[PDB]
Amino acid sequence: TRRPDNTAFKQQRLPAWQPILTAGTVLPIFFIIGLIFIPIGIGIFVTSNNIREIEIDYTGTEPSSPCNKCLSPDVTPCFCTINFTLEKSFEGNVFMYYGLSNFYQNHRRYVKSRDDSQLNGDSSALLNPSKECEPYRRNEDKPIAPCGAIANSMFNDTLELFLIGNDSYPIPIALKKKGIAWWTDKNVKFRNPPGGDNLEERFKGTTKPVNWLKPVYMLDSDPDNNGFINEDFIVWMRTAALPTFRKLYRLIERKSDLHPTLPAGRYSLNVTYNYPVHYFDGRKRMILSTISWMGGKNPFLGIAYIAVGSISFLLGVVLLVINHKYR
Amino acid sequence: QPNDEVVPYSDDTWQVKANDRTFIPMNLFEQFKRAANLYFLALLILQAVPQISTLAWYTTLVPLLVVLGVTAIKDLVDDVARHKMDKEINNRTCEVIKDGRFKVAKWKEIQVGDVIRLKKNDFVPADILLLSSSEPNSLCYVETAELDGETNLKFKMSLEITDQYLQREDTLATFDGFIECEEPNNRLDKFTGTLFWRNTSFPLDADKILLRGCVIRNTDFCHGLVIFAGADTKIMKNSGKTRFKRTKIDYLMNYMVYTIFVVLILLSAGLAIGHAYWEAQVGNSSWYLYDGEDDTPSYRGFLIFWGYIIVLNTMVPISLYVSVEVIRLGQSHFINWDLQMYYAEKDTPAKARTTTLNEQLGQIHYIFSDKTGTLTQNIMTFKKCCINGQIYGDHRDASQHNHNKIEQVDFSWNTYADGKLAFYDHYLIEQIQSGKEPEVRQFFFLLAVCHTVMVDRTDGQLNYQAASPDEGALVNAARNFGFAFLARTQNTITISELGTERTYNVLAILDFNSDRKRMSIIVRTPEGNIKLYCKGADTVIYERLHRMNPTKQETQDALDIFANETLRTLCLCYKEIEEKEFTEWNKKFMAASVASTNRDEALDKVYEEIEKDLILLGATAIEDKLQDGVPETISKLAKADIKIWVLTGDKKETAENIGFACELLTEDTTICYGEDINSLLHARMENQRQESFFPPGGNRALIITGSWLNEILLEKRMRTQSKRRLEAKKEQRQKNFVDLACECSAVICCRVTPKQKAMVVDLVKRYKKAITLAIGDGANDVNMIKTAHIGVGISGQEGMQAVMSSDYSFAQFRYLQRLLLVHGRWSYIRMCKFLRYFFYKNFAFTLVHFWYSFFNGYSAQTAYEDWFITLYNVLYTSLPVLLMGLLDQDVSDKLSLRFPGLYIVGQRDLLFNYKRFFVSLLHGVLTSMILFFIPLGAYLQTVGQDGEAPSDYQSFAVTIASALVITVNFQIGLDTSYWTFVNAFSIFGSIALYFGIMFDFHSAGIHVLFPSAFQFTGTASNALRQPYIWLTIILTVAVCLLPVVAIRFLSMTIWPSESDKIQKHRKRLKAEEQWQRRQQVFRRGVSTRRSAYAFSHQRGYADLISSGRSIR
Ligand SMILES: *[C@@H]1O[C@H](CO)[C@@H](O[C@@H]2O[C@H](CO)[C@@H](O[C@@H]3O[C@H](CO)[C@@H](O)[C@H](O)[C@@H]3O)[C@H](O)[C@H]2NC(C)=O)[C@H](O)[C@H]1NC(C)=O
C-alpha cells in the first residue's frame, strides 16, 4: 500500500478535445457538402452525356432478325451480319467490348472452379491439377491444362467490322488484339509452364479442355501472346461481379490523319456465331464506345451526386429552421 | 414480549484434548460456460467438411486463437493478483505451545486442543477457553466492536481451578485436560460444555470463552486453550455462502446473443429456400454451372443452408467478451490508481479486488451501511455542559462574549491536564478558579466520583482504563478541569480536588443496567457527611426530583438545546443522607446483598428505595465523532436518488443519536418504532382479511430493533397444506414490510444479527428488484457484503475481516462520493457506448453477403476478400472502440459531483435497453444496404472502362471493403466526446493499417511464394487509382454518415439530455455553496420533544469493584 503515481493517464486527466455539436458546427458541413457535390454531379453528368456509344444486340433470340438461323446451327460455322449506322463520327481511341447478360459468373460453384497454381506456370501443378476443378480435371486419362469451369466456358465468337463506303465495297477496319488486359495479370499472374522454347513440347501429357475446339497451342501464332498469357483468355478468366458484364475485346486506334477514327456512315458486323447462350435467357451484345478523360459513361454517379447535394442543402436549411425555432 | 436490549441469536459431542494436536481448466471453463466458443468450434467443424464449406479454415481460427490467448493472459494476471492480495494480507502470528515452550506460529498452524498465549490488543485467533491471565482472578477484558457494533468492553473470567494452577508456562506445557462441548454453531451468546481435569468435572459457560473477533484490552497477557478453529469458529459460521456475482448487463448480452442466433438461423433458412428455387428454375438451364453431381434443387438448398450459416457466422461477435473484459480490467485499474480515493493518514489506497462488477456501480438503488466503524471513528468527546441553568462550552473569551474567533484555553494551571481535551471557553475556567459558585466544582466532583473506571499508574502517567466510552470521556473532562480520579481501592477513592488530595470512603455503588438507566454512588466525606451522587437518563431522573428545584426549567432548556445539536445527554443529581436513614438502608441493602437466589430483584428494590429526593446539578453533552464528510456524502447520494439504510448491531439509543447526527433524521421526520410498524401491518392484514400506508406528503423514519424485526416478519397430508399456507402468509407479510419500509425517508435497524442484515438485504433485492450495495467493516457485516450485488469493506483498520469478501475496499465512507458518481457512472456510460457501437459495426459488416445473395444465385459467395474477413474484427475495428471505452467522459468529475442528478440516467436503464439493441441492428442493416447498393449502381455502368478497367469481382470487393472501413472508423469518431490524442491516433491509424496490410497482401512476392492462398494479387494497385472508384467511396461514406449527424443534432436540439445542458452552460457555472449543517431549529411550545439520552455500559463492574475481584 503506497501513494499511486500522479500521471495524466492514471488520474483520468489526459489532454483532450470536447466537440459539442453546436448549431454553428454542423450546418457548415452540410452546406459545404452540398456546394461541393452539386458541381461534381453536374460535371460528371455533362461528361457522360458527351460520349458516343453504340450497343448492338445480336443474340438473335427474337425472330425477324438476321441471326436467328444460328439458334439451331446444323452446320458448326454459322455466320450472321448486322447492319447499323453511326450518325456522328467518333474520335480518338475506340473500344470494342463483348457483353453477356444473365450470365452468373459470380456463382460460388463457378468462381472456385480454378487452379491459380497451374496458371502460374508450375511444373508440379501442370500435371495432377488441383482438386477444386474436379468436373473438368481430367478428360479421359490425362490432365486438362486449363482445368475448371471458368476456362471451358470461354467466349467462342469472332466479330469483325466493315465500313460501307461510297464505292459500295466493304472496307475492313483493323482491330488490335493486344494490350486489353491488366499488366500485372499478363506479366505476373499468368505465365507459361517453365522449360523449353517450343510451346508444343511444353504441354507434354496434357490435353485440351473438353469444350475448346483447339488446344492451348493454337490460341495465337505469336509466341508472346499464346499459352496462359493469351489476352483473350486473361480477360475472360477475370470473373465479373454481377450477372451483366462487359469484357474488353478489341482496340481501334485513332488514325494519325485528321479524319475521324470511325467516320460517320453505315457499318456491317460480321459475327461467327459459336457461343450458345439462348438456353438460359442470356443475351450477347457488342458495344462500341469512345474514350473519356474522366473514366467513362456513368450517369448514375452524376445523378446521385446531384440528388445528394440537393438533399444536403435542404437538410441544412431545415436544421437551421429547427434550431431557430427551438433556440 | 420483544426485548430491545438483546440481539436474537436464537431466532436464526465435540471433544478436545490439551497438548494432543493451469491453462487447460481455464480453457475448458471458458469453452463450456461461454456458448460462443462452442459455437465457433462447431463452425470450425462445419468448415472442415468440403461438401458444405464456404470459407477457409483460417477465418475462424486466426481470430479464435487470439481470443483464447488474450483471455488466458487476463486470467493468469488475475490469478497472480489474487494470490498476491491473499499472501500479503494474511500476515498474522500468535504464540502457541507446540514444543517445550512458546513458539511463534501463523494463525494457520492452530489445532483444536493446543494452548496459546495472547497479549494486549491482540486479535483472538480462534475460540479460546480462558485459562489464566495476569489480572487478579484471571479476569480479561475484551472489545467486541466487530462481532457486534458495541463499543464497550466486556469481561471474561476463568474457572477457579484453572486460575490457581495454570499461572505459569511450565504447567501449561504439561497441561492435559479433556473437554466435551457442543458441536460448532452460529450462536455467539451461549456455550454449554464440560471440562474434565484432575479427575473432576467442571461446567463451562459463555463467560469463559473468547470468540475470534474479540480484541484483548487492559490485560498484559492471557493464556487459553483453543476450542474451535478455522471455519468452525462461531463468527465464521455466520458468514453466508459465497456466490458468483453477475452484472445486470450480462444477462441482457446473453439474450442479445440468443436473438442474433435466431436471426441468423432465419436468414440462412430463407436464403436456402431461395437457392433451392433458383437452382430449380435457372440452375439446370445454365450449361456452364455443371459440376457433375446428381443433386436435386432441394438437396442443394439443404446443403447450402450450412454454407450460409458459415458465411453469416460473423454476425455473432467473436471478440465481444475479450473487449468487455479488457474494458472492465482497465476501469478497475483506474479505480485502483485514483488519488482522491487515497487515505494518507493510514496510507490505504482504494482497491478493486473484483474486476468484473464495474458498470453495476452506476445502477445502485439502495445502500446498506454499518454504523460502528463505518459512519463513526469510535471517538467521543465532552463538548458542552449546563450548570445551574447556564450553558457552558460555547465560544467565549474572559468573562464576557467578545468574538467567535477565540483561541484555546490553556490548562497550564492544572497539573494532571494534557492536550487530549480541546475546549474553547474561558468563562468556565474563571468560574472554576474563583470558586464563587461551589456547585461548579461539585459538578466535576460528581463527574469524577460517580464513574466506575479503573486507574493504572505503572509509569506514573495516571492512565484511565474505562469500560464505557462515555465514562472515559467524562472522567477525562473532570481530570482536565482539576478534579483527577487518582486511585481506588475496595472501600476508598482518592480524588484530588484542585491540588488537594482527599481520600473519601465509598459506602455503596448503585450499579447500571439497561432498565435502571442510571448509576449512583453513596460515599462518606472525610468530615463525616454522607452523600449520594447519581447520573443517568433525564427521563428516569426527572421523576425523582425533590419538590424544590428552581433550575429545573433552565436545565430542561439546556437538554433540549443539546438534543437539538445531536449530542448524548445525561442528567446529574445529588442528595444528603442522615445517619439513621443511612444505617436502616444499609441494613436492608446488606440483607438484599446476600440473598443470591433472587439477588437482582432485591437489589433493584433497595436501589429504588433510596433514590427518591434528588437535587439537580446540570447536564453533560458527549459528541460521538463521525468520519469526515459523512453527512455531505449522505446528502449528495440523496440528491442522486439513492436510499441509505443503516443496519447496525448497536443499541437503539446510539443508533438513533447517529441517525440524527448524520442528518438522516430531522425535526420534521416522525419516528416509528417496532410496535407502531407491527400495529400498522396488523391493521393492513386485517383489512385484507396499493393504498399508501402513510399520506404521501408526510415525512417519516423507521427505528426497528432486531427482536421487533423478527416479530413483524413472523420469523420468531395436512402438514403440506399447513406449510404452504404458512409460507404464503410469511411471503405476504414480508412484501408488506418491504413496501412500508421503501415508502419512508430513512430506515435504521438496531440489535440485528448478521443473518438479519443478510435477510433485510435479500428481502429488498427480491421484493423490490433493486440493485443493492453493502458497506461495512468487522465480521458481522461480512454476510451482507456477500449477499448484496456490490460489497464494500472499510479497510485501513486492523480488522481485515470485511475486506476479505468485499468487492471494493477503500478506507473511508466519504470516498463513496467518487465510487458511484464518477467511476460507476462513467463505467456505465462507456459500457453502453461500447455495446451499441460494437453491435452496429458487426451487423453492418455481415449483411453485405445477404444483400449480394440476390445477384449471385443465392450461392453463398462472399463479397469480401478471404483475408479481410479474417482481420476485420481483430485489426481494423478493434482498438478504437476499446480506447473509447477506456477514455470517454461526458462531463468532468468536478462537474459530475456537483450535479448528482446525472446518476439517474443509469438508474433507470436508459442508455442501453432491449430497444436500443434493435435500433443499432436497424442502423447496421441500413448501413450495409447503402454500402452495397451504391457501389452496385456505380458498377452496373462503366467504371473506368479501358485497358486497365477495374469492373470485376475483386475491384467490387475492395471498393466495398474500403467504404465499410472508412464508414465504421468515422462512426466511432462521431460517437466519442473525449478526443484524446490516442483516440484520434487509433481512429486514423486503423484505416492506415488496413490499407497497408491490403497493399501487402496484393503484392507480387507473396503471390510468387504461394499463389493458392492469395487470389487478389494486384487488385488494390489497379483499382484505387481510378477517380470513379474514389468518388463512389466518398459518396457511400457521405450517405452513410450525413443522416446520423442530422439525427444526432435534431435529438440534441429538441430533446437535450442533462449532460448536454450541463455542457452548453459549463462556462457560466460558478455558484457552488458547500454543504452546511442546518444551524438553528430552535422552537417553542413543548417542554420536551425528544429525549437525547444515550449511554453505553454493561452491568456487573460495580459488583467486581465492591468485591476484591477487580482489585490487584
Ligand atoms: C466453344 O466452341 C465450341 C465449338 O466451336 C462449342 O462448345 C463445345 O464444342 C464441343 C465440340 O468441340 C462440344 O462437344 C461435346 O462433346 C461431347 C463428347 O465429348 C458430346 O457428347 C456433346 O454432344 C458435344 O459434342 C460441346 O458440347 C460444346 N459445348 C456446348 C454445346 O455447350 C461452343 O461454340 C463454345 N462453347 C464453349 C463452352 O466454349
Ligand SMILES: CC(C)CCC[C@@H](C)[C@H]1CC[C@H]2[C@@H]3CC=C4C[C@@H](OC(=O)CCC(=O)O)CC[C@]4(C)[C@H]3CC[C@]12C
Ligand atoms: C444524404 C442522405 C440524407 C440522403 C441519401 C439518399 C440517397 C442515397 C438517395 C436519394 C435520391 C436517390 C437517387 C434517386 C434517383 C436516382 C436515379 C437512378 O437512375 C435511374 O434509374 C434513371 C435513369 C438514369 O440513370 O439515367 C439511379 C438511382 C438514383 C441515383 C438514386 C440514388 C440514391 C439517392 C441519391
Ligand SMILES: CC(C)CCC[C@@H](C)[C@H]1CC[C@H]2[C@@H]3CC=C4C[C@@H](OC(=O)CCC(=O)O)CC[C@]4(C)[C@H]3CC[C@]12C
Ligand atoms: C424471417 C424474415 C426476417 C425474412 C428473412 C429471410 C428472407 C430474406 C427470405 C425468406 C423467404 C425468402 C424468399 C423465398 C423464395 C424466393 C424465390 C426465389 O426464386 C425466384 O423467384 C428467382 C428465380 C428466378 O429468377 O427465375 C427468389 C428469392 C425468394 C423471393 C426468397 C428471398 C429471400 C427470402 C425473402
Ligand SMILES: CC(C)CCC[C@@H](C)[C@H]1CC[C@H]2[C@@H]3CC=C4C[C@@H](OC(=O)CCC(=O)O)CC[C@]4(C)[C@H]3CC[C@]12C
Ligand atoms: C430505408 C427506407 C428509406 C428505404 C427502404 C427500401 C428498401 C426496402 C429497398 C431499397 C433497395 C431494395 C432492394 C433493391 C434490389 C433488390 C434485388 C431484388 O432482386 C432482383 O432484382 C433480381 C436479382 C437477380 O438479378 O437475380 C430483390 C429485392 C431487393 C433486395 C430490394 C429489397 C428492398 C430494398 C432493400
Ligand SMILES: CC(C)CCC[C@@H](C)[C@H]1CC[C@H]2[C@@H]3CC=C4C[C@@H](OC(=O)CCC(=O)O)CC[C@]4(C)[C@H]3CC[C@]12C
Ligand atoms: C437516407 C438513407 C439512410 C435512406 C436509404 C437510402 C436508400 C433508399 C438508397 C441507398 C442506395 C440506393 C440504391 C442505389 C442503387 C440503385 C441501383 C439502381 O439501378 C440502376 O442504376 C440501373 C437501373 C437499370 O438500368 O435498370 C436502382 C436504384 C437503387 C436500387 C437505389 C435505391 C435507393 C437506395 C437503396
Ligand SMILES: *[C@@H]1O[C@H](CO)[C@@H](O)[C@H](O)[C@H]1NC(C)=O
Ligand atoms: C446489310 O445490307 C446489305 C446491302 O446489300 C445486304 O446485302 C445485307 O443482307 C444486309 N444485312 C443485314 C440486314 O443483316
Ligand SMILES: *[C@@H]1O[C@H](CO)[C@@H](O)[C@H](O)[C@H]1NC(C)=O
Ligand atoms: C463476312 O461476311 C461476308 C458476307 O458476305 C462473308 O465473307 C462471310 O459471311 C464473313 N466472313 C467469313 C470469313 O466467313
Ligand code: BEF
Ligand atoms: F458494525 Be455495525 F454497527 F454492526
Ligand SMILES: [Mg+2]
Ligand atoms: Mg462496524
